[PDB]
Amino acid sequence: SVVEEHGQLSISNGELVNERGEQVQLKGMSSHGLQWYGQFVNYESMKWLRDDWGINVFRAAMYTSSGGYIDDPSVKEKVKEAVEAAIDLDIYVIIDWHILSDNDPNIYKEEAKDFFDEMSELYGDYPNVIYEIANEPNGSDVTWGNQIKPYAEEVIPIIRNNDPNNIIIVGTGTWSQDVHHAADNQLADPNVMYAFHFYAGTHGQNLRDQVDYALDQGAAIFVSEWGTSAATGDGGVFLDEAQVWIDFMDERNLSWANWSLTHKDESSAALMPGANPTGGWTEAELSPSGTFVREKIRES
């Protein structure tokens, strides 16, 4: 129903809109790294998220390093499984080239181009697909103008040769926080969005103001990852600040995916130890974070 109704997504005046020009807000879950917790990514779990949580997007977090795709490329087949499930379930799907320790997206740019060529050839005639070409550029030696923008200007044409207008999300500096510099030096492609990531354990008032600055430059922003925890993915749960961010995102038409769908014993994990990887989770099988995130999506 979601993808049939909204169909082709595009950016109009800095906003994500559907094929009839109406604003639409995606809300869903990210996997954790597919090399570690890939068992939680399957049609049945995604169907349960759709039906019981109300998700309308799923993010497949394919780490490049840390035992991910560069080390063992088999994890690309799990991305394909996720995409196929999203197509069958009629929800959107984010294909996330999940850089992190490999902090400059240029490190594995040749592999990224290859990977996005393959994915856009396979899936470029479905409206479900959103390409996230570099999760979290980071480090003081990685800037928008010097590193990230020219990386994007190599990868985007590879995608566009196969898929001329599905959404592309481009990471920003400082772990996808530096939307200000991106917004001042935007990419040409009209269906690009810039990633912004937050963690509720950080006091967020200035970060909200910087998102507003970026929006005011006509840049579109997708909150392609956020957590209820501290910035490490752990360190307690911060539901008061999370709620402030939830309300902010609703007021600004900002789509989002929460980190993450795993049973790992860290505060950002949505599931308890013993949660079934194919779904069906009782209240007792959701973590503090998962209970909250589920409520936010069901409210929506």
Ligand SMILES: OC[C@H]1O[C@@H](O[C@H]2[C@H](O)[C@@H](O)[C@H](O[C@H]3[C@H](O)CNO[C@@H]3CO)O[C@@H]2CO)[C@H](O)[C@@H](O)[C@@H]1O
């Ligand atoms: O258990 C698997 C490995 O986990 C590694 O820690 C990861 C955290 O569990 C995870 O929450 C964190 O997520 C990041 C995400 O990649 C980018 N956005 O920010 C999130 C919060 O920091 O990523 C951690 C690093 O991959 C751990 O380091 C390994 O030892 C484990 O094998």
